[PDB]
Amino acid sequence: MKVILLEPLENLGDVGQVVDVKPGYARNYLLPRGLAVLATESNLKALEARIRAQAKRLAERKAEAERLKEILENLTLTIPVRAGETKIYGSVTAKDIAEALSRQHGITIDPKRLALEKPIKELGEYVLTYKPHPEVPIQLKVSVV
Amino acid sequence: SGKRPIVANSIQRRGKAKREGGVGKKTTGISKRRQYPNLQKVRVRVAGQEITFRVAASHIPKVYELVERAKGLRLEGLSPKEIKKELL
RNA sequence: UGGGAGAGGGUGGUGGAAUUCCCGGAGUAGCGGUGAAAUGCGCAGAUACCGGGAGGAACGCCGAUGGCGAAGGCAGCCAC
RNA sequence: CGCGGGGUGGAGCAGCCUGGUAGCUCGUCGGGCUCAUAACCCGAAGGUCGUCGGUUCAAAUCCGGCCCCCGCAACCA
RNA sequence: GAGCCGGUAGCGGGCGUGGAUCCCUGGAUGUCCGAAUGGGGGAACCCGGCCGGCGGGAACGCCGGUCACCGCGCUUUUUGCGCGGGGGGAACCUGGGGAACUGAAACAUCUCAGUACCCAGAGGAGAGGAAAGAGAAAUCGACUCCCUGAGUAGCGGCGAGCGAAAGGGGACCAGCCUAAACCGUCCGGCUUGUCCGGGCGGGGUCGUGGGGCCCUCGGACACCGAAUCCCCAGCCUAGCC
RNA sequence: CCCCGUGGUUCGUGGAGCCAUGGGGGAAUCUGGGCGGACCACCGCCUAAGGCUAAGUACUCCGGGUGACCGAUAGCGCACC
RNA sequence: GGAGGCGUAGGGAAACCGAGUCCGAACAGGGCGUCUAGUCCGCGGCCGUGGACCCGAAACCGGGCGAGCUAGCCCUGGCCAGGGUGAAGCUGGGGUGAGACCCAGUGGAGGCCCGAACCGGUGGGGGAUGCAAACCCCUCGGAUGAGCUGGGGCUAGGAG
RNA sequence: GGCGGGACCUAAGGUGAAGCCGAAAGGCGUAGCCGAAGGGCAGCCGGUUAAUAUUCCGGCCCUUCCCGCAGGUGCGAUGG
RNA sequence: CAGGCUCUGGCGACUGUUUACCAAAAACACAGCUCUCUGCGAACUCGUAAGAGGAGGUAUAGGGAGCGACGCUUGCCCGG
RNA sequence: UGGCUCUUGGUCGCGCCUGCGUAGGAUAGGUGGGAGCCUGUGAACCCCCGCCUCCGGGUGGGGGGGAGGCGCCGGUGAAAUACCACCCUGGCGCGGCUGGGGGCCUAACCCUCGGAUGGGGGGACAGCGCUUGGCGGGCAGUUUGACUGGGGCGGUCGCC
RNA sequence: CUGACUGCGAGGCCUGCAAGCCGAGCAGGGGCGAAAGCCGGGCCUAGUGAACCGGUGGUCCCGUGUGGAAGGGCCAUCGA
């Protein structure tokens, strides 16, 4: 019988797959113990939702990180800070960045996604990196003045 | 019996023993026999409680298939027998 | 009173050896048996050999020109 | 009638499969030996391998047909 | 329209043209039993719960209503509410089950026979019914029943027996609803999704195939019309000239 | 639909179809699918796996009508409690 | 009311042919068939299929009714005069190392004995259209047991 | 009201909610219920009628229930 | 009211049971012997089944068969 | 009617491989292509191993190694040995396909336990449904000839 | 040398039916003899079995709407 396993099963396969197993094995084990479900014409449909949804869901999430890819790449981030001769007065972390970035223009970004752990304590310009999408990063130009 | 989605009252028919050649001639010895329908028990969860089906071998899936249509149903509160009826 | 020797007797328990049987392992044409041979046993897998198990009976060497008891009779081993 | 197994010395069997080997037991005759049969030991005659036929260098062997026995399930107006 | 208080007189006592008896129609009353049903039970008996009533009535008794069970819907569950069933019926009918004698001059196939009988179910009927038909006619056109086809075709220890249809002639004549595609709604499931499926409503019903969604048509006034509903004609339930 | 076991039909295994279904395998949606007596081709027929349907037909407990039907051993078992 | 039926053509299994046709190569022979004949109704004789002149089994099969008789069992009651015999055990004494065992007394066992009720029915007689579809008289067996018996209950037709 | 039976109990057996099986009819069966010469249960002597009598009458004796009351106590069940 | 007795043989040990209504026996039953099945959801029995009995028993138990107290004893033949 | 795992037979193509009576140099499985060819796509010879086994040779992996290594033919025999083409006997490896065998499991199914949406035991067995064959007077229907100095036993039954 | 021929058959024996039995002559074709002529088995009278069921070969036939196949009929012959 055709079934839909919603659980990493050794011999069978990973979640969401469709494999036909022996009747009993599914009628007295899988289905009963809540591992897979009788893949009827009904569930096959609701499965297409699982696919199409999650699909265009991250395909539109990567399509939105496509707008930040175009604008965050062709723009420099000038940060008006104080500094002695080489190193900075205050100190710029990932907040002083996503903050003055949301202000100087209005772009909404998280200091969490922004790939930087080092609390910038030197003056000059650098090339940061932001991670909106796992496979579509964006090098955010810096300019700590 | 046979009273389930199957509905297969075991009907009797003839069971005749024949001696012959087949391509030489043929004769017989007739009797009456009761042909029962292969019928097994099917226990299944179904919402709260459990539930048994004295169903046939043919219409086994029909049960679990029905259990599927049952998810689109609203039931609860001590429903041993009443589940079956309200179960189509 | 004090010591000793002993298969003296009865009870409960216990040890190894070996026989047969069954299981498992390996292996093949013969095994067995007599003066000789047959009956019998084995290609359905015997004999020979290896491992595990079951059971009963009798106790090798010590042991003898030996000991013990009334006679019959009494022997592996421990205790009563 | 259809299926498959074989016919091997006076007799049965191994050889057959996957051809280069007629051998084995007993009988029987002569020899050894014994009180005697026997055991046991030496040697020997007897088989176109049921038949006819084919392929091969050679056919008991592999194969076709023919004769017979034995086995098999089935059949009988 | 003159008598009457059944058969049925007698004993006894009454009633009727202020129109009885009698005949019809509707209503009332209808103990106890019996599907029996509050519970029990050996039918016509026995005991009881709750509300109300009667009696000095608390005991006790009586009276009136009420309380079986099963199904479907309502109750989100339990507890209640409504609709229905149960049982009987000469014969008839469909369905579920189903002999043997007997015959074959024996008997086992075959026969009797789907007969007898059993059981369940229906109703004034039942069954069946608009084609996944028939069958050889580029034919018929639901079903049922009568005649015919025909003791034919064919079936058969090819024995005994068994025995059909097409078609033709007549009776009567009727054709509809739905599931699914598709659109809308309320509920909970949940992996929460542009969905799953439940119910509901719109939609749709077919053989030259039909339907659905989209596009064009103007697409509606119209037409078809109840197997339902209302009225009435007539008609049966007493009589009169 | 196919096969195994059977019922119906005129059909008793028979060249055995068609209709039904107890067991098993197990599909498609008009380029679908059954059928016209094994089976193939060709030609034609018909749309299965939901339901409903008046009339014509059966019967006679019951009321009526009639009889080359009986007339009390007949005729229903019973003319009559 | 002509649907339908019989008849006006037969031969052959059939294809088919036709006053002919079948076998066969046949212009032989021969089998069958032409030379014309009917239908419809009434009545009567006989036959078929029906119960089929009339009366009669032993049987068989379906469904149902009975264990108030008879058999067994389940449940709960009841009954069994009187007499006899005298096991075990027990006690005392004897005995032995202790004991076995012995004796006496006590004791009251038993599908024990005899014998009524009670149950049954051996042998003879009668009875035989009986008092009676199994009785009567004499006689005889059991009689605390596998006993008899009341009431309640279960089991049945190839079944009990 | 007092004997016998029921408005008490249970026995085999029957019935039979639950539950199980059977082509139909039906078959099995826990609980409870039904079911008795068994368990529980308060009347003895005598008189009187043409006929009935622990039944009517006499004498002596007794039970259940309801209501009220005085006193005593954690009272109370289909459950132990 | 109220045994006639004795001796000897056959069968069956014995009390018991039977052919209501021609047979009470030498027949059957019996204690005890042997064989055989059965490891428990037992074998066997009734039922289509559910189930029940077996048995709220467990190989010293239960089913079947034969023989028939007790004593002595039970021989040879698996070819069918 | 299920999970896993060891094991084993069948089977289809393909990969690799065993098959030695003498003669001829030999150990030529069949018929043939073909005198050319294998080798730096590194050989002859050595060293280690799996395996067939006629007792001697062959074949695959790897390393040393460095330029050779085979053959027709004459020969002899039934035929010929560069390499190559296919196939036969039997074998090994691959996956498909399908069946047998054993062991463990738990969840179907069954049993069971102060009721459990659970725990324990059995376990893909059993039970049951369909189909297969068999045993099967426990039960059912039914046959069991006739002539005949009665029947039965005996003899006979057609033809000359 | 294969007349142990095919297609036939006037007539007649026998006889309840069915079955049995003789056969001139015709045609095709064939053997023997010069020919006439003979040959449709054996000097003759027993050496056998209706029908159904089916088998094997053959064939002008039938073939379920149509070509064809299955199946069948016909001639031959088989299993009492």
Ligand SMILES: [Mg+2]
């Ligand atoms: Mg679908």
Ligand SMILES: [Mg+2]
């Ligand atoms: Mg700037």
Ligand SMILES: [Mg+2]
């Ligand atoms: Mg600045």
Ligand SMILES: [Mg+2]
């Ligand atoms: Mg199934």
Ligand SMILES: [Mg+2]
């Ligand atoms: Mg299936």
Ligand SMILES: [Mg+2]
């Ligand atoms: Mg409800």
Ligand SMILES: [Mg+2]
């Ligand atoms: Mg001292």
Ligand SMILES: [Mg+2]
């Ligand atoms: Mg000592």
Ligand SMILES: [Mg+2]
């Ligand atoms: Mg010892």
Ligand SMILES: [Mg+2]
């Ligand atoms: Mg030897």
Ligand SMILES: [Mg+2]
């Ligand atoms: Mg031997």
Ligand SMILES: [Mg+2]
């Ligand atoms: Mg041997």
Ligand SMILES: [Mg+2]
């Ligand atoms: Mg001595």
Ligand SMILES: [Mg+2]
């Ligand atoms: Mg074969």
Ligand SMILES: [Mg+2]
């Ligand atoms: Mg064989």
Ligand SMILES: [Mg+2]
């Ligand atoms: Mg030999």
